[PDB]
């Protein structure tokens, strides 16, 4: 088991996993698009990648906010949430 996986298993909260990763990473790279991501590469060629947008604040009375929630969900969760999202939009 490589370093990135051990960090992800032992430090489930992003802030703690970040401390572990930054202590030993040989590279740190940013992905700017989408949620934004920070990539920590380790000596064993594993990589821990952390999302920069892991929360969403939805105003249920605002169509754009609801649509933004839907877009921010991954595809599988969006399918699970689709009928609720439709209910929300119809109520606006
Ligand atoms: Ca995500």
Beta bridge partners of 23: none
Determination technique used: X-ray
Q: How many domains does the chain have?
A: 1
The Cα-based distances of 81 to 1, 46, 56, 89 in angstroms read 35, 33, 14, 12
Ligand 1 center to residue 87 CA distance, Å? 23
Residue 40's nearest CA partner among 14, 79, 69 is 14
Ligand 1 center to residue 55 CA distance, Å? 9
Range of the domain at 75: 1-92
Strand positions, DSSP E, 1-92: 27-31, 37-41, 47-51
Ligand 1 center to residue 37 CA distance, Å? 10
Strands 37-41 and 27-31: antiparallel
Nominal resolution in Å? Answer: 1.3
Ligand 1 center to residue 44 CA distance, Å? 25
Ligand 1 center to residue 41 CA distance, Å? 20
Ligand 1 center to residue 50 CA distance, Å? 9
């Amino acid at each position: 088991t490589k370093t990135a996986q051990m960090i992800a298993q032992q430090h489930k909260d992003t802030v703690a996993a970040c401390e572990a990763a930054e202590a030993i990473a040989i590279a740190k790279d940013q992905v700017w698009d989408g949620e934004g991501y920070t990539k920590y590469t380790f000596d064993d060629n594993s990589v821990l990648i952390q999302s920069g947008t892991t929360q969403y604040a939805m105003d249920a009375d605002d169509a754009d906010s609801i649509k933004g929630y839907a877009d921010w969900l991954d595809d599988e969760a969006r399918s699970a949430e689709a009928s609720e999202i439709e209910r929300l939009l119809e109520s606006v």
